[PDB]
Paper text:
The parasite adhesin P. vivax Reticulocyte Binding Protein 2b (PvRBP2b) binds to Transferrin Receptor 1 (TfR1) and Transferrin (Tf) on the surface of reticulocytes, which is critical for red cell invasion. PvRBP2b interacts with TfR1 through its C-terminal domain (residues 461–633) with a buried surface area of ~1271 Å2, and with Tf through its N-terminal domain (residues 168–460) with a buried surface area of ~386 Å211. Here, we isolate and characterize anti-PvRBP2b human monoclonal antibodies from two individuals in Cambodia with natural P. vivax infection. To further elucidate how human mAbs recognized PvRBP2b, we structurally characterized several antibody Fab fragments in complex with PvRBP2b169–470. We were able to determine eight crystal structures of PvRBP2b169–470 with antibody Fabs with resolutions ranging from 2.45 to 3.45 Å—PvRBP2b-241242 (3.15 Å), PvRBP2b-258259 (3.05 Å), PvRBP2b-273264 (2.55 Å), PvRBP2b-253245 (3.45 Å), PvRBP2b-237235 (2.45 Å), PvRBP2b-243244 (3.35 Å), PvRBP2b-251249 (2.90 Å) and PvRBP2b-283284 (3.15 Å).
237235 and 243244 contacts PvRBP2b169–470 helices α2 and α7 and part of the N-terminal loop between residues D173–N174 and Q191–P194. 237235 and 243244 belong to the same clonal group and they bind similarly to their target epitopes with heavy and light-chain CDR loops adopting similar conformations when bound to PvRBP2b. When superimposed onto the PvRBP2b-TfR1–Tf complex, PvRBP2b-237235, and PvRBP2b-243244 show no overlap with TfR1–Tf binding, but they do bind directly opposite the Tf binding site. While these antibodies are not inhibitory in the FRET and IP assays, they inhibit PvRBP2b binding to reticulocytes by 47% and 43%, which suggests these antibodies may affect Tf binding from the opposite face of the Tf binding site. HDX-MS also reveals changes in PvRBP2b regions that do not directly form antibody interactions as shown in the crystal structures. In particular, 237235 and 243244 that interact with N-terminal loop regions D173–N174 and Q191–P194 also show HDX-MS changes in the loop between Y186 and Q191, a region that forms interactions with Tf. Based on our HDX-MS results, we propose that the binding of antibodies 237235, 243244, and 254255 results in allosteric changes in the PvRBP2b regions interacting with Tf. The fourth combination antibody is 237235, which is proposed to allosterically affect PvRBP2b binding to Tf and has an association rate of 3.57 × 105. The crystal structure of R5.011 in complex with PfRh5 and a neutralizing antibody, R5.016, shows that R5.011 contacts the N-terminal β-strand and loop at Y155-L16220,21, and similarly, 237235 forms contacts with the N-terminal loop of PvRBP2b at D173–N174 and Q191–P194. Of the four antibody sets, only 237235 binds a highly conserved region within the N-terminal domain.
Numbering used by the authors:
A (entry chain B): 6 to 230
B (entry chain A): 168 to 463
C (entry chain C): 7 to 218
Amino acid sequence: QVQLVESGGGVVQPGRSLRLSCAASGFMFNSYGMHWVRQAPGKGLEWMAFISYDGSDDYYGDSVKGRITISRDNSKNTLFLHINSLRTEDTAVYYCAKESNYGENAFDVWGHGTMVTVSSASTKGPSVFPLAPSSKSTSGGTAALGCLVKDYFPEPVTVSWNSGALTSGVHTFPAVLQSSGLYSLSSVVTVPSSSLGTQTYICNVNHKPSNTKVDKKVEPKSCDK
Amino acid sequence: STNTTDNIDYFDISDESNYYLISQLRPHFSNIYFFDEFKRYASYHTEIKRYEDIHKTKVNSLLNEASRAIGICNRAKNTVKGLINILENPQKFKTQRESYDVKLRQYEEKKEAFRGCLLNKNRKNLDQIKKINNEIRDLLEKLKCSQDCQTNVYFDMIKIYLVDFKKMPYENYDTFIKQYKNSYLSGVDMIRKIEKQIDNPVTINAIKFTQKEMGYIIDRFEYHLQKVKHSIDQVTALSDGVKPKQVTKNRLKEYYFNIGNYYSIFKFGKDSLNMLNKALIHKEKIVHNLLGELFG
Amino acid sequence: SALTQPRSVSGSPGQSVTISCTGTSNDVGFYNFVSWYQHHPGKAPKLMIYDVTERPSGVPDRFSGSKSGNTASLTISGLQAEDEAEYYCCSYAGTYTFVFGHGTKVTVLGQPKANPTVTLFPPSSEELQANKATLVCLISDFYPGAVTVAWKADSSPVKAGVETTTPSKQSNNKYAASSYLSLTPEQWKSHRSYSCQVTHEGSTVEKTVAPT
């Protein structure tokens, strides 16, 4: 019944400070070292800091030395993490971890993590750009088209094709967070290549946080630039 | 419930000729904590700024060489950990066929092999403690003072140490080991007397092995506690006694080594006590589950 | 600091796999303190091997840990559907520091492997009129779901302005991924061609679009 619960995450502005919390229970908290681990959206696990049982010693990884402070309050069974000045690369999931019972060189219990999303953006409706089918986009009896939903905040956005008439071959990708702090995603349909001139395909972009409803027809690339 | 030992960090060993105590936890040697303490002393003196290089190179290498050496004994650690798990667990012990006396001899054999490994692998590392000590003495010679050495840094570290001393719960530690050893010796006596009437040797033997390890850990707990208590008392007396504004350069060299030794032992013991307190809490839950199995 | 792990390993239910983890003489090779953690989507990471070889209670015998030189290994015997997860090695790095590996996705194969289909889109005329340029490279119908995307501008690699989504399962249990390259319109016109490089299961496929 050992549980670790991270807290303090969400949407945070770059250049400001952030303090994350880790509520521990089910074990004697004041007797174990603790660690902060983070995972970037597309990268692996990154070890950040360690603090001793009674909080008198703290050590850091080279990539985060001078940027963070690990700390604890053994009277409330809570571990803390202080980021001095948030950067774009701090967008990540931050895991709280307990020193393992079998020895100090492993961690036997981790928390579920909390999501830190660093962005300075206000609410913004997206720009929809068409991804047109062409010779480079056609192979055999299939053709790939789509819509590019760019520069919005916050998540999510819904994408349908011809007011839900299309279903087969439709794949709407997850959103990516850019260096600007705005999300981007694209939806793609694979349809017969011969039917491109006799059919009109439209995406139905809805970004309700901005009360946005955009329809963009996607037509095949005529001629050359 | 709890019926298996998961952590055997409580075993330690001491050197035969220079008598350094080796812990399975970093920094393994209390002398490393003294080298850590000399960083704080060296940051307050212009002349000994070069120690930042010495600590980052000689001290931290010794630390990592020590942790590497302890890691060389992970195999001997698992071998004695397997015997502990067998001897403490009746259900696990019944799965094999050797007597309790045969396996208890193997445990003693593997316990000393593991303890001996912790010392054999650290012999070269222990030889560095001396040379880092003397290197720090010669470094304190470059102080420009002679008969005028200010003791402000000396008494400022003492004031900090008195704050750090109060963070460790000494009264709670002392009350715990007194009630623990009291209960422990009672159950040992109770097991010795109910043993003749109950035909359950395996469970009683599992209780007696756990009491044997409990006795070992109680000894390590008591050893560090009064060592912690001694360094706290001596440094406290230094805060109460005379407070000269200035001493000679050689009295100050003895000063920093004295409080550095006392404080290094206090935190080394504090490290061990936190570990040993977890071992006694664990062994007591095991011996309680065994007693419930015996009487029930 | 980083321990290098294979991006993808796979096997069918019942056979073995082996995840390598190559470190340096200052971490994996210096200590006997390598760790192994299993990670499922939305689940807390779980310790499977500590101290190079030892298993915590509750970890099956199938999970095995070894080490040779600067490389540690994790062997999973008799694969099961539960074993499909991300695995990370971890090693003490000295002076109270640790270092994790890149991470290996284990997939227990439920269908035959499938190389991806790659379709690259140049910036739309609509977006270029707005003084923005984004290149969209779509990766579809690949299994197992693990891919590495590279971008090169006039045959020279370019990592700035690159974003890539993690592989997402399609309705046919195959995976899809997407990578975006955001440029200024001046960069897009000042190059002869751009390329999206997609590596999956040890084979690389390429697609080029040109502003001309």
